[PDB]
Design an enzyme around this catalytic site. Structure first.
Site, PDB file in Angstrom:
ATOM      1  N   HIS A  22     -23.088  58.478 -35.534  1.00  0.00           N
ATOM      2  CA  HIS A  22     -22.687  57.085 -35.822  1.00  0.00           C
ATOM      3  C   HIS A  22     -21.298  56.908 -36.491  1.00  0.00           C
ATOM      4  CE1 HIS A  22     -24.557  53.233 -35.129  1.00  0.00           C
ATOM      5  NE2 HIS A  22     -24.652  52.862 -36.393  1.00  0.00           N
ATOM      6  N   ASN A  70     -24.593  45.999 -42.007  1.00  0.00           N
ATOM      7  CA  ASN A  70     -25.173  44.671 -41.807  1.00  0.00           C
ATOM      8  C   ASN A  70     -24.497  43.691 -42.760  1.00  0.00           C
ATOM      9  OD1 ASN A  70     -26.847  46.335 -43.687  1.00  0.00           O
ATOM     10  ND2 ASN A  70     -27.920  44.393 -44.079  1.00  0.00           N
ATOM     11  N   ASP A  95     -19.607  53.749 -30.612  1.00  0.00           N
ATOM     12  CA  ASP A  95     -20.500  54.622 -29.823  1.00  0.00           C
ATOM     13  C   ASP A  95     -21.513  53.877 -28.878  1.00  0.00           C
ATOM     14  OD1 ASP A  95     -21.138  54.381 -32.838  1.00  0.00           O
ATOM     15  OD2 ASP A  95     -23.138  54.991 -32.210  1.00  0.00           O
ATOM     16  N   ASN A 116     -25.817  47.636 -34.505  1.00  0.00           N
ATOM     17  CA  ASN A 116     -25.968  46.622 -35.569  1.00  0.00           C
ATOM     18  C   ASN A 116     -24.631  45.989 -35.990  1.00  0.00           C
ATOM     19  OD1 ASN A 116     -25.244  48.094 -38.456  1.00  0.00           O
ATOM     20  ND2 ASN A 116     -26.543  49.577 -37.357  1.00  0.00           N
TER      21      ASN A 116
END
Length: 191
Positions: A22, A70, A95, A116
């Site tokens: 990530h 977030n 990604d 997200n």
């Protein structure tokens, strides 16, 4: 002032996450800065890291956020007003799950899939019309969940191939800017 461009990369803070799947967006950015000259420093009236200069024929502005995701659009919105930039002159790197391990594709508009961070950004701007650069990693083994699979390390056979791939993504970003969308799509693609 000829009206500039803004480039951005996504990831998470600390030693603990430095090399997971990530964090790819952070890796391509440390290289581009080395092709210009100087190091980063904090912008006080927003709270993030920035670098300014010259690249591929014109005037440019580079950056890295500093919060859990977030919660990452509260610093990207304000930065865009300070310099007066339009939505069609913004570019972003991340990604991707629906493509094989070792492929690259370009794009304008569409859906956000399963990342997200992408949704937090479009919700602060008020629209979904900006450019993107995609890099793939594959699908999960059996009945293992998608949000737990991306926080692990790479296997050993995948480890000797990573420094080669990071170079090819930087070369492709300089071409979109100096030549255009339709034509740069003809050299890099398939089917």
């Amino acid at each position: 002032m000829a009206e500039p461009l803004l480039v951005v990369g996504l990831g998470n803070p600390g030693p603990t996450y430095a090399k997971t799947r990530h964090n790819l967006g952070f890796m391509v950015a440390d290289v581009l800065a080395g092709r210009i000259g100087s190091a980063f420093k904090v912008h006080k009236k927003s709270g993030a890291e920035v670098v300014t200069g010259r690249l591929a024929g014109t005037t440019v502005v580079l950056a890295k956020p500093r919060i859990s995701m977030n919660e990452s659009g509260r610093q990207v919105g304000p930065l865009a007003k300070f310099y007066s930039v339009p939505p069609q002159q913004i570019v972003v790197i991340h990604d991707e799950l629906d493509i094989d391990f070792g492929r690259i594709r370009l794009k304008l508009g569409g859906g956000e899939g399963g990342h997200n961070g992408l949704r937090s950004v479009a919700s602060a701007l008020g629209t979904k019309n900006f450019h993107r650069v995609r890099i793939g990693v594959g699908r999960p083994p059996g009945r293992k969940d998608p949000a737990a699979f991306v926080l692990e390390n790479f296997t050993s056979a995948e480890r000797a191939e990573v420094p080669t791939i990071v170079e090819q993504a930087a070369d492709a970003t300089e071409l979109l800017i100096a030549q255009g969308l339709e034509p740069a799509q003809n050299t890099v693609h398939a089917w």
